[PDB]
A paper describes a structure:
In incompatibility group F (IncF) plasmids surface exclusion is mediated by the outer membrane protein [name]. [name] is an outer membrane (OM) lipoprotein that is exposed at the cell surface. TraS blocks DNA transfer following mating pair formation (“entry exclusion”) whilst [name] acts at an earlier stage to inhibit mating pair formation (“surface exclusion”). [name] is a hollow homodecamer shaped like a chef’s hat.
Overproduced, affinity-tagged [name] was solubilised using the detergent dodecylmaltoside (DDM) and purified. Cryo-electron microscopy (cryo-EM) of the [name] preparation revealed homogeneous ~100 Å wide particles from which we were able to solve a 2 Å resolution structure of the [name] complex. The overall structure resembles a chef’s hat in shape but with an internal cavity extending along the entire long axis. The bottom of the ‘hat’ inserts into the OM bilayer as judged from the position of the detergent micelle and from the local surface hydrophobicity. The [name] monomer comprises three distinct elements: a globular core domain, two transmembrane α-helices (TMHs), and a long β-hairpin. The globular core domain is composed of two α-helices packed against a predominantly antiparallel five-stranded β-sheet from which the TMHs and the β-hairpin extend. The membrane-spanning portion of each [name] subunit extends from the core domain and consists of two TMHs connected by a short, periplasmic loop of four amino acids (S136-A139). Notably, the TMHs from neighboring [name] subunits do not pack tightly against each other, rendering them relatively mobile and poorly resolved. The hairpin structures of adjacent [name] protomers associate into a continuous β-sheet that forms a ring around the interior face of the open end of the [name] cavity. In the native cellular environment, the transmembrane end of the [name] cavity is almost certainly sealed by a lipid plug and so does not form an open channel across the OM. However, the structural data show that [name] is actually an integral OM protein in which a large globular domain associates with the membrane bilayer through a pair of TMHs in each subunit.
Residue numbers in the entry:
A (entry chain H), B (entry chain I), C (entry chain G), D (entry chain F), E (entry chain E), F (entry chain D), ...: 22 to 247
């Protein structure tokens, strides 16, 4: 019952995109944005940069190819992606014991009353039980989790001091501490977006365009309209 | 029994809006408000800005389109939205085992006494049990959770110093610390509003106007009347 | 049932590569990269350096053999690799008791009704039960976990101070603390990549080319295109 | 069933070598290495030093017998070694109760139907049960764990200050704190390697050459090729 | 079954010696060692000092009787020794209930079918059950644990400052703090060695020579060869 | 069964003496020791001082009666002693229920078949059960725990500053803090010795000479021979 | 069975006296002691002061009635005393249910076979069960716990500064902090003695002389002989 | 059985008085005491002040009515008093279910064999069961707990500084901190006394004189005799 | 049984008043008190101020209406009051299941033997069971908890500094810190009184006069008599 229940509940693709924290931007009249999209995950998001540019341009901004003449920077990295089956947390039922029991009972029942003979009701029941167990194992609640790191840069008139601190671990004994200081006129803020795609026997190709569309809109909505 | 019990209990739309903390504002005679509404969530709240303006104007304030000549700022961001089924926390009953048992017993019972024959009471019972299990899976206690970040700005005669501190994580080794200082005559306060919409098989389109109305009134009620 | 369920679920090779943290790099026009790939693990990844160079060159960079004339350094070390069987966490079922019970019942059942005689149904059942238990033990959900440490170096105009701190443990009594200070014009950042390969009775030779391909792309994608 | 299941699963020698942490070394053109290998454990690793020298020489380095004219030092100590039986964590089954039950049932069964007589089926069953329990106790999942401490020294142009701090515990009352300071031109880093050897009824002599080979390669791979 | 299972598993003497931490010594050309071995435990280790001297001399060092002309000091104290029975952690089975049940069943069984009479099968069964319970109690998994504190002294050219801090507890109210400072040219490091000897009904006299041999080699192996 | 099992296992006196921590003493040519032995416990250890003097003199030292002309001080206090029954941690079995059940069954069994009559088998069984319960209560695993505080003083050339800090609790409100400072040429170190004596129905008089002998040797072994 | 088991085990008075911590006193030739014994507990210890004086005088000291000409002070306070029944921690068995069951069964059994009649076996059984329950309630494992605070004063040549700190709690709002400083030539140390007296149905009058004798010896043994 | 067991065990009044901490007073020749006794509890302790004066005068002190000419102050406050039933922690048995079961069985048993008729055995049993349940509820293990705060003042020659610190909580926002400093020649110490009175169906009037007597003696015993 | 057991146990009104902490007041000859009683709770305590004045006047003090000429201030606020049913913590028994079972059994029993007929014993039993369940629900162990904050002010000659610190929370972002300093000659102390009133089906009107009387006496008893 668990296999078909999962199939009915998760019959439709469900995509959820959740931004971790709110980045507040001062009102301004500038409309130049520079984009820098990376993907260090093992899954394809090649269409993300184009969709972000379209969403940003639809809000009244102009996308420039050189970062020096851009008032805003949108830096995004699709950091990691994970795949898991939600049925695996239900216990031993996900293994296929329930599917085997239903198949075995159906095979013996359909043979025990119709042409019972002797031994035939065991061979058919075993074959049906094996098929039932196999069919249970082929149904999984596939869930795709994606993590995207977003960095937004805004130009400012105030002097901004950037202190780079890095504790480069060297072994089990210690680390190499690197320090430097630079000044500029740019404020940088970071935020994280978590994406989820869920469907029965979901293939990432089907969920890829929807994940890109929702992720692009969420990142582009940090900027104010016009 | 769980499916119909959920349907009866959650037959009506229930919307709850809860502000996290109270923002205290000094009494004043100014009535100029600037609005800035964002939506980084994956759900539509396009009518929120208009409803906030109507609620603010109904309290005696004047909405201005330029932030420089506004005594008050209302900055709101619909940060994230989540959907979950409350029946999923009830255990294995939500899977559909209870629905299958009721359907199987009804199918066998209606056939065991009326035209029992042989084998017929099993085929009808299995079909009825499958339908009963399927009907249980199609009933869910849909709950929508929404998080909205609110920032309120108030002009003041005192000098306000803003120190921007950002620890931009760079990897597993360290971070880039950004610091800057600016002065102004504006006080900013933050608060959070949590919204909930609950109904059986709820679609967000039905709950969207109610969520917007309650959220707009809650945010606009931070300001005093007149 | 657990043995064949594992075989069906894990019938295909699944490789997952996940970068731990995002390294942000400033936009630049330099395209010289120096590579330094190490492997202190007990498994072969000899093709990793060549695949990283191909992926880096495909993005518009030029690989140089001398570190002094390289704007970027990519230092990677395949630190450790582990092998485990996921079925071992299922309990006593992984031992082979379930396989023995199925084999014993099948052996006695196929003999109890056909040529029952006396004592024969026990010898066949014991032999079939032993074979069933043996076949269960030969099926394992092999999972390979690999840890890779990545260090990225970027040239900068700012003066960078490196303080080496090492607490070399000397016994149970204390340690020898080593300190030194050097200056340079290079920023170094660290990150970690976790790789997983899963299949039934998986041999590392089959998963080696896929692990190298995914790891090379993930590391090379830290750099921006062109 | 546990005894033969362990024998089948652990029928082949499995050796795992895992370095705890990554030691990063700056690129250089020096190729002189000094070796210093110790063994304070109770197990023989006499061939480790020779295998490290061969692996180091195969990577293009020259091994020198005097530490003063060596750019690199490789100091390794096989600190401790432990032996344990993995079956001991399975519970009372490892004691031999399961083996006794199988032997007792087989002895009584083979006698209860063939020449039952009286009392004979108890003497044979008891003898077979004792043999079955004894055979279970002679099968163990032997696992050898080895800990190796590694210290790597690299010459540098920077001045290195070494502060020796030792809190020599004197009783339950206090300690004798020893402090000293020396300067030099050598950086030292520490790391740890954990080795595991697993097989049914494993003897350390069989696993000794494999442990030495994997440990030597792991330590020598800290150095870059050529 | 537990008694004979323990006898078979622990039929051979097993001695394990594990050094807690690694003491690193700089390479040097000195070969003078001074020994100072103490034993505050309740067990005899009179042969430890002689075996340490033999192991040290076999590595190329010269043992001197006066500490002032020794480059190295080896100070060892056999601090404490403990004896425990590993069967005591198995529960009530170690008491002898299992042995009584086997003896009682054997006594009644051997009499119930052969010369049953009346009352005789109870007297023999009770006597056999008592003997079986007694034999179970005489079998124990004897484990000897030994703790040895090791202090190694090395001459150095640097000035070494020793600060003696002792918080001598005086009652429940406070303590007497003693402080002093001395200077010297000797570095001292501490480490701990844990020894284990396990056998069925083990007597410490049998395990004494093996414990001394392994402990002496472990301590002497802190020094480099030649 | 628990009563006789305890009697067999603990039939012999077992004395364990364990020093808590190691006190390290510098090599020296002095051989004058002053003894000061106290006993604040409730048990007799009158022979401890004489045995310590004999053990110290057997190692080449000379015992002096005046502390001013002694290079070493040995101050020991037998602080506390405790007595407990190890069978009390076994549960309700130590109460005597098991002994009553065995006695009641034996009384009824020996009467139920031989001269059964009526009512006689109950009076004899009750009397035998009461005796069996009483005999169980008279068997206890007596364990004696003793704590001894040891303070060792050594003359030194360095100036030793003793700061006496005492927080004399005055009530629930506060305390009276006492502070003083003195200088001297004597180092004091503290350690603790834990003694255990275990036997069935053990009387402290039997274990007293063995406890004194082991305690005296352990304390005297802090000093080096000759 | 619990009632008589407790009576047999605790048939003899057992008194345990345990000093919490060791007070170390420097060797000296003075023999003047001043005593000050208090008793704030609810139990009589009137003979404690006399027994302490006798024990102190037996060790060679002279007791003086004026504190100004005494080198040593012994200040003791019997702080508190508690009484508890150890059977109360055994559960519901201590209530008397076990005693009622034994009495009820004995009453019905002695009447069911001898002059059974009708109804008589219930009246006798109820009366015997009530008596059995009552007798169980009259047996208790009485344990007396006593806490004694000890303060020892020793004259010294060093200047001793006493800082009195008292945080006198004034309500739920705060406290009144009292501070003062005095100088003197006397060192004070504190320790605690815990006394236990255990017997079945123990009356404190029987345990009073033994508690006084053990407490007096323990306190007087802080001083060295002669 | 629980009701009568409680009645037998707690048939006599038991009063326990325990002082929390020891207040140490320097020996002196002054004998003037000023008393100040308060009672903020809800129970009557009107006789406490008179009994303290009698106990103090019996020890050789003189009670004065004006605090300025008193060397000692005894300030006591009976802070709070609580009443609880110890049977309430036994579970549902204290409710009266056990009493109802005994009464119901007795009523049915006395009627089932004597004049059974029909229905009569139910009416009598119900009435007897109700009476039995009612009688169980009227028996309670009444325990009275009393807390007394004691403050003792002693004149001194040293200057005493009293710093009054009070954090008067003002709301959920903050507090009003009050600070002041005064000097005097009086030391104040605080301690707490806990009193317990236990009996079946105890009325506080019966326990009042005993509580006063024990409390008065405990407080007066802080002072030394004469 | 739970309903009537609660009715019998709680048949009488029980009022408990407990002061949290003791406020110590210096002896003085002043007798002017100013009262200020507030009640922010939802329950009526209108008679509290009059009863406090009567209790204060009965102790020899004079109540003044102007705070400036009062040596003592008594400020009290009845902060909050809560009502709860103690039967609600007993579990499902408080719901009324036990009452329904008793009523159903009584209804069926009184009809099953007298005029059994058919179906009549079910209608009467259901009606009686419903009445029994209803009667159980109408019985509750009503407990009223009241919290009273007390502030006592005392005039003093010392200068008292009051620092007002208030952290007025402004939102989720921060707070507004208010600070001020004033000087005066008045000490203020705070304490808390907890009041409890318990009875079956208790109405607050019945417990109001008793709560006022006990609360007034407790607060007035902080002051010394005369």
């Amino acid at each position: 019952c668990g296999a078909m229940s999962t199939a009915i509940k998760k019959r439709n693709l469900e995509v959820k995109t959740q931004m971790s924290e709110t980045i507040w931007l001062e009102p301004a009249s500038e409309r130049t944005v520079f984009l820098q999209i990376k993907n260090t995950s093992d899954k394809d998001m090649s269409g993300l940069q184009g969709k972000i540019a379209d969403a940003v341009k639809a809000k009244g901004y102009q996308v420039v190819t050189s970062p020096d003449k851009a008032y805003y920077w949108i830096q995004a990295n699709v950091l990691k992606a994970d795949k898991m089956d939600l049925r695996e947390s239900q216990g031993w039922l996900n293994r296929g014991y329930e599917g085997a029991a239903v198949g075995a009972a159906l095979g013996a029942g359909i043979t025990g009353y119709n042409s019972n003979s002797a031994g035939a009701t065991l061979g058919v029941g075993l074959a049906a039980g094996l098929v039932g167990m196999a069919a249970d194992a082929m149904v999984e609640d596939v869930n795709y989790t994606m993590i995207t790191d977003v960095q937004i840069a805004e130009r400012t008139k105030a002097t901004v001091t950037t202190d780079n601190v890095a504790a480069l671990r060297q072994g089990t004994s210690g680390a190499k501490i690197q320090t430097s200081t630079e000044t500029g006129n740019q404020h940088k803020y970071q935020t994280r977006v978590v994406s989820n795609a869920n469907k029965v026997n979901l293939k990432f190709e089907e969920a890829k365009p929807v994940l890109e569309d929702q992720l692009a809109k969420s990142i582009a909505n940090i900027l104010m309209d016009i």
